[PDB]
Write a structure and sequence with these properties.
2 copies of one chain form a homodimer.
Chain A lengths: L1 E8 L4 E3 L5 E3 L2 H7 L9 E10 L6 H13 L6 E5 L5 H11 E2 L4 E5 L12 H14 L3 E6 L2 E4 L3 E3 L8 E3 L6 E4 L2 E4 L11 E2 L7 E5 L6 H8 L4 E6 L12 H11 L2 E5 L12 H8 L3 E2 L5 H14 L3 H9 L10
Parallel strand pairs in A: 1-4, 1-5, 5-7, 7-8, 15-16, 16-17, 17-18
Antiparallel strand pairs in A: 2-3, 6-14, 8-9, 9-12, 10-11, 12-13
GO molecular function (chains A, B): asparaginase activity
Pfam family, one (chains A, B): Asparaginase_C
Enzyme class (chains A, B): hydrolase
């Protein structure tokens, strides 16, 4: 049993020196301060690849993290990645599209408090991630508190509480209690060979449809990006009265993908349900179904990295690649 | 006891036409289909002001709804507004800033299912709204299920489930059980005279900070609007590495307000907590504290309607006008 811990930064790593310097402690220091390891059965190796506040994460970093994960598939039985919470769900989603048929568990985790703080959540989060890394099953997951969640189905829903990450429109995968994994839902696990497929187009923009959003703004946005995620109300639709945003969307969607998700946290979209939705479909809008906002964005980046054909972008967005979207 | 029901449309007023669902029923039809009125003590009158899918609501409509509410303060003891769910929280927030010291309860409500459907939520939502309109206390509130919530503290968090509206970072006001109101939290109720103050600038944009968001896009957005709401990660901050959005923000914030809220649903922002936050504060960014996204947007519209002085906009955004933000 050999596990790799990949360190990438985040609050979990934050520490001050005796002279005031602000350091991002290494994966080895983190495990030590968490009280992990001091024993075998499972050999734990460590590597540090980045030291970022996860606010600063860019899509090029997903390629770096992804390359390190995929190359580790030869040597290890499980992987845990320590990462900032701010963009944890974006990295977990993007890695799920960039890496097909992972042969081992790959578990991202972080904490809301620094490991150096005395009531830190980091020790618990690491234990949960490591227990699943050694006893769980293949795929890309996020560990937080005692929960294991599908990487394409998580969001950061609290900015302050310890229970900061939830699974959205999809059940929790498993819970860790002591050294046991209690499985709630095992996803479909692809028998195929591991594939690394990193091409993505980072030039996408995520905008909220709001009363008062002007045609002019949406035009300015459309001319400066390659893809748009619109965050609509409820089941989804586009305003056409007074500020006719539908007209801007039908023109844009001739040349670039426009994907619609919802402002709601739960339930996703259904553009079939209302006329405002149906007009949106007629104008070329791609529905995000029940996908998280993180998964919608990273999947579109991944789509655009593989094609500029609008019909093939539609097929990719609506096909279930790695558990991100409910099908039929 | 005289109550006014003001009709505005919404799914609650929907009927299935030959061309699909329209928001065509009047307030009178809604009450009738709900089995309401059928009691001695309260006289219920009706007025219809709009018949829109709430996706089509624009800020100019808040003035129309507001004028009808304020004029009704002379004749009535309570008001219920029937409204679509898609923008209910925007209307409730905006009316809280446009109407100071309402002298009676003003309760907005809606439904997720048409009143004509057999398992409709509309009957219950109306009863809750009407019971509080007659036995509650002054202010602007939203009724949904058995709950009464502060109008500046709600969001639509589900696009499908019946418990679609939650109070965010602030307790529920009351619960209605049969014909009783059980108070959970009584807010501060302003003794002053009713004031109608409708000036707002609708030219604001709400954009999500995402990995891959380019300086070019944020510039294009800034030049086409008068105010920006940025939706940042966690406790809030702006990316400065690779895609230096902080630089775009420091230039914009010299001329226009840039307000920062969070992508999380709970907990709001605290730009003091991290360096990425502190650089954001140094660049002139206005924190939204713990406000809902709906309240942040409508408050900024209201601010910009009263001044283009950036310091006075800051003071308004951070001052607690109507329960929207937790103080000092």
């Amino acid at each position: 049993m050999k596990l790799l811990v990949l360190g990438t930064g985040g609050t979990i790593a934050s520490a001050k020196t005796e002279m005031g310097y602000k350091a991002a402690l290494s994966a080895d220091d983190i495990l030590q301060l968490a009280g992990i390891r001091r024993e075998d059965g499972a050999k734990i190796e460590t590597r540090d690849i980045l030291n970022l506040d996860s606010t600063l994460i860019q899509p090029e970093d997903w390629v770096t993290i992804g390359r390190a994960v995929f190359e580790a598939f030869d040597e290890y039985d499980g992987i845990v990645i320590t990462h900032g919470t701010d963009t944890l769900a974006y990295t977990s989603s993007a890695l799920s599209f960039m890496i097909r048929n992972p042969p081992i568990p790959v578990v991202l985790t972080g904490s809301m408090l620094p490991i150096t703080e005395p009531n830190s959540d980091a020790p618990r989060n690491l234990r949960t991630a490591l227990t699943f890394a050694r006893k769980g099953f293949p795929g890309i997951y996020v560990a937080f508190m005692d929960k294991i969640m599908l990487g394409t189905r998580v969001s950061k829903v609290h900015s302050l509480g310890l229970n900061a990450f939830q699974s959205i429109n999809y059940p929790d995968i498993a819970y860790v209690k002591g050294d046991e994994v209690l499985v709630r839902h095992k996803p479909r696990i692809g028998n195929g060979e591991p594939l690394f497929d990193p091409e993505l187009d980072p030039n996408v923009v995520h905008i909220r449809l709001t009363p008062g959003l002007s045609p002019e703004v949406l035009r300015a946005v459309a001319r400066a990006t390659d893809g748009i995620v619109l965050e609509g109300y409820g089941a989804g639709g586009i305003p056409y009265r007074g500020r006719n945003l539908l007209e801007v969307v039908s023109e844009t969607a001739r040349e670039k993908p426009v994907v619609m998700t919802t402002q709601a946290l739960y339930g996703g979209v259904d553009l079939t349900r209302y006329e405002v939705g149906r007009r949106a479909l007629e104008a070329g809008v791609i529905p995000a179904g029940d996908m998280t906002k993180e998964a919608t964005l990273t999947k579109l980046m991944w789509a655009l990295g593989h094609t500029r054909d609008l019909e093939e972008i539609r097929k990719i967005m609506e096909r279930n690649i790695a558990g991100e979207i409910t099908g039929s």
